[PDB]
Amino acid sequence: QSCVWYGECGIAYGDKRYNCEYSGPPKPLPKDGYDLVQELCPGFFFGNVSLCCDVRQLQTLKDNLQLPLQFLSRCPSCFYNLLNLFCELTCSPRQSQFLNVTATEDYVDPVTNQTKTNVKELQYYVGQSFANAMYNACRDVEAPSSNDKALGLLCGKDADACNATNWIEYMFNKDNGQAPFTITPVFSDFPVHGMEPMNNATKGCDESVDEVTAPCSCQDCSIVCGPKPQPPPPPAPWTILGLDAMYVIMWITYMAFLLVFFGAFFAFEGCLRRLFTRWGSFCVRNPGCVIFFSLVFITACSSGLVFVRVTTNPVDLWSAPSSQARLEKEYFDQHFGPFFRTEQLIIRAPLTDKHIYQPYPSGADVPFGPPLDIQILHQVLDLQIAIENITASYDNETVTLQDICLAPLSPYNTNCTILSVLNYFQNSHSVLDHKKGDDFFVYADYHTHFLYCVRAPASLNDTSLLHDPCLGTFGGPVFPWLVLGGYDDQNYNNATALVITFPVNNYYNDTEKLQRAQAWEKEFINFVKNYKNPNLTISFTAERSIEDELNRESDSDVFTVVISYAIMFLYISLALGHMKSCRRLLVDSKVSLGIAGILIVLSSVACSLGVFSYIGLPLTLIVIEVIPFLVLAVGVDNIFILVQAYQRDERLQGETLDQQLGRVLGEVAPSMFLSSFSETVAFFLGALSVMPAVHTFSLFAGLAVFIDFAEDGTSVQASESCLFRFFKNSYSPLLLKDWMRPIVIAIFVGVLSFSIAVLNKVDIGLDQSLSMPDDSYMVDYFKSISQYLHAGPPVYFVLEEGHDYTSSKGQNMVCGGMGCNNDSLVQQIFNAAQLDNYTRIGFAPSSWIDDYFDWVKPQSSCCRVPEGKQRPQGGDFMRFLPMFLSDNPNPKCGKGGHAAYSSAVNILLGHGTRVGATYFMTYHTVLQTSADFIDALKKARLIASNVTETMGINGSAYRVFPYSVFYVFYEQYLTIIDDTIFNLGVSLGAIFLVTMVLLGCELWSAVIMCATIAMVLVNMFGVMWLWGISLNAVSLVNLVMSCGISVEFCSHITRAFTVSMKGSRVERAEEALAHMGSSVFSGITLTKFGGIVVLAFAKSQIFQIFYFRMYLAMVLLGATHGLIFLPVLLSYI
Ligand SMILES: *[C@@H]1O[C@H](CO)[C@@H](O[C@@H]2O[C@H](CO)[C@@H](O)[C@H](O)[C@H]2NC(C)=O)[C@H](O)[C@H]1NC(C)=O
Ligand SMILES: CC(C)CCC[C@@H](C)[C@H]1CC[C@H]2[C@@H]3CC=C4C[C@@H](O)CC[C@]4(C)[C@H]3CC[C@]12C
Ligand SMILES: *[C@@H]1O[C@H](CO)[C@@H](O)[C@H](O)[C@H]1NC(C)=O
Ligand SMILES: *[C@@H]1O[C@H](CO)[C@@H](O)[C@H](O)[C@H]1NC(C)=O
């Protein structure tokens, strides 16, 4: 083994040295060079480390690595072979085999005058295969942020002219101003005149350099690339449903035809109860006090229980508690509580054009969208600074953004967190205004930094001539997707919108601090609303917009329903007693039910919004049945009055009917104890139902009687009219309603198929105020970013190997997410992840850093490591040490010094084994619809299952958690399918069982009433999934009420028809329905007559425009079916 040089001699040019000629054997490297050799040329680091280089040469090699690193650092395999080319030249103990000195000159030591010899030039015999592999591993590497190949910057020519041998030739030519002296390469896989070319093994860009150094990426490599995604599923059925409906229709038609052809070819208990009731009445018919006294008692119980009208309604608790939805939210809290909320603005520049700007030294045309005009950025910065300076007052105190913001690096840094493109310029007008240029070029400006910072937002030093940091003033990177909108692919320069985001404390556990934050928010909303700049359109996130709009909009419409309620109760008042006899009752009846309900609920605590539309419209049941019992008696007139004339007309039609009506109602509201977020309003009303029932018992009858004994004339006429109507109805049924009845069946059939073959969750569409609209419009337009978090809490974490396995799970999750997409982009996640396992690794790779104590004090630097061999081991496993260091950070360590810390961990003392709870979050955009977010949530749950299902263990111990400002809120829209089927199902049983608690005709009554259950439902669904309909936490309650009123109708028509004393074919039926038809047109008609004022009327928002919309449609359909349904059933019988 022999050298050609050893050590450094004279200056060549600049700061550059020739090496000293030396032709002896290699020399063991001093221990003081072991770090350098381990770092640069670890292949030589064994035995006596006998090399043809000294420590000075290795230091010089390290110092010269800056420019290759500048362009190749991202692809370690590419850089590795290059380093080996230089290591072999500099240090190989067999230099003489592949190097031949070709020029020299004297070196004279200035002090001793001893002569040595500069190696001025030499020839280097490089393997052909080595050179080609070195080029091959680097040829796809892309410059840090640039569609140009890194080799175009290291080859003295463009990448399309760069080849393996001319690249090496260029690097080795002193003319390049970097190489200290020229090395002339000769490329051969064969010996050349006894020289044995350097042909060291090489690594491709698809290979790992070592155990702690991964292969190169796709973006910077070719070998390790592909394949894209191919898991797209395409479903689409439905026609089947249509065919079935059609088939059914055909069958029906056939049946009808057949029928036509044929015609051409040819109880005790109940009674007893009634009797008892009558007896009671007769007794009661001997005193008014008792009754009223009872009403008075109810006046108290109702009002009494209403003590402390604390009937809350806020804030966002309707998904109900318990289960996973709530339990999951609570869990994430104990670990961190409320991650926090964001006030967010989207900003566009409608009066500004795009523009071009060549960035040195490429000079390629890069277009920049309207909002990235330099002047609009200055204007957006002024907006931003003004927002930071907003103050609100609460009590006598002042509230700033600095009091409520996420300031991640407090106290050492109170700097608030503002996600904005202006934070790439540290929110500084001057810094952004800067621009290093001369008479010839602009070398660096607000463009270069931008194009660099979108690729390296954590950088504390632009690689351009500006040398400005990218890191935001809050101490963390601002990711480009989260601050720009309306750009294509990752061409952030083409953005048509800026997004500005301020995280502020939600203060879920602190009431006094939350109120202060909400005071600030109100000022923020005001500031934005009144901000004047023709150059910018600014639009909303906040908090009140969604909470203030609902409480600010939902009011005017009140006057609508209110009015309608009055005009309706007026008619129902005129109807029967007309005068001041019936009015009193009702007013008391409606009050009793409403008052009683509030009292029944006060004994358990509860409250709600829709709980009002139900309470009011629900009261109808009490009025309807109550409005027909009195009317029927009015139509009475025999040998008796008051005495038996009241018990024979009351305990005869009111006993059974009412008795059955009250039950069918209590069964729908009573059994409302189910599982969901509506049982409260439900039960409360159902309870108010028996109450309202027992009320109108002796109260209405007695009162109506006690007092019942121009106005008279009017009553008679109405009665007469009713009678006439009944007669007409009878006549109609007499003819033949078989054809139309079949047609009706068709309508129901078509409805079931059209209603069962549509569906939907529920979106958010509030009135057109302003704020809310802005946020809704901005969201629709924007895209790519704006977020929620998927999040896991994990336990244990102590077995180096289980951490490696958990990291593989984590990396795999990042992949699927960055893949799963839809239409023209991903849907699932976003997405990507920054747990921490990578931070530790980074630390291991590198080194220390300075911490500067606040306000003053000497600098503190402290740390260490642990390479080379150990380095790989340390990073591989163990974790207490790393963990306790990694949690305490706030100043990088290398070429700069910034902040790169976080949170989520919280062990005790130095028990690193007890660490919790690491949390990884990938924010994904959506804002599509109630069904869109629900679909994404559905995917995330399966993602959580897949990760937890992959590698589990013992029983239970934490799992996946998808907490996104949309869950708990949409969590309900999840089990909506089971709810509807379960909710209605529970009523179908309570109704079929109740209607039998005083009958049990097997198929007679059972089917009669049972048919009404599916009869009306198909209508409600049709209108909902058919025309102007909807569905949600309310619609579900809507369907419930529908089945309720429906039961009411049927109940009366049927309890008196089924029996039928003097029985017949279809004659007795027409007789019963007659006395029941008059009431069907009274309450029903009126009720509709009221909705119209509510439905046919107007409003200032679609909100109720639907709620009270279907009501009238669904309520109307049910009423119509009442008469038809009964008639059809009778005929069938
Ligand atoms: C160039 O290749 C040679 C031959 O593989 C490397 O020398 C070997 O290095 C390993 C790793 O330390 C030792 O185990 C062998 O004993 C060495 N063999 C010989 C013949 O010396 C050398 O490390 C490579 N050069 C560089 C810079 O990595
Ligand atoms: C202009 C760009 C492409 C140059 C990129 C390659 C540079 C970094 C290369 C070209 C020639 C190389 C030098 C070749 C010879 C020596 C002598 C050695 O005893 C110390 C290292 C040193 C000084 C090398 C450092 C790296 C070097 C300067
Ligand atoms: C080195 O190669 C050159 C030709 O390039 C030759 O003239 C010289 O004699 C050789 N010296 C040695 C030691 O091989
Ligand atoms: C879940 O992972 C399993 C393998 O464990 C895989 O077969 C399936 O395609 C994955 N599904 C989703 C939705 O990620």
Curated annotation (Swiss-Prot):
Official protein name in the record: NPC intracellular cholesterol transporter 1
Span of domain SSD: 557-709
Function: Intracellular cholesterol transporter which acts in concert with NPC2 and plays an important role in the egress of cholesterol from the endosomal/lysosomal compartment. Unesterified cholesterol that has been released from LDLs in the lumen of the late endosomes/lysosomes is transferred by NPC2 to the cholesterol-binding pocket in the N-terminal domain of NPC1. Cholesterol binds to NPC1 with the hydroxyl group buried in the binding pocket. Binds oxysterol with higher affinity than cholesterol.
Organism: Homo sapiens
Disulfide bonds: 3-52, 9-20, 41-87, 53-91, 75-216, 78-138, 155-162, 205-221, 218-225, 405-416, 453-470, 815-820, 862-893
Effect upon mutating residue 943 to T: In NPC1; late infantile form
Reactions mediated catalytically: cholesterol(in) = cholesterol(out)
Lineage start: Eukaryota, Metazoa, Chordata, Craniata, Vertebrata
Gene label: NPC1
NCBIfam families xref list: 2A060601
GO biological process: adult walking behavior; autophagy; bile acid metabolic process; cellular response to low-density lipoprotein particle stimulus; cellular response to steroid hormone stimulus; cholesterol efflux; cholesterol homeostasis; cholesterol metabolic process
Site, Important for cholesterol binding: residue positions: 86
Keywords linked to the UniProt accession: Cholesterol metabolism, Disease variant, Disulfide bond, Endosome, Glycoprotein, Host cell receptor for virus entry, Host-virus interaction, Lipid metabolism, Lipid transport, Lysosome, Membrane, Niemann-Pick disease, Receptor, Signal, Steroid metabolism, Sterol metabolism, Transmembrane, Transmembrane helix, Transport
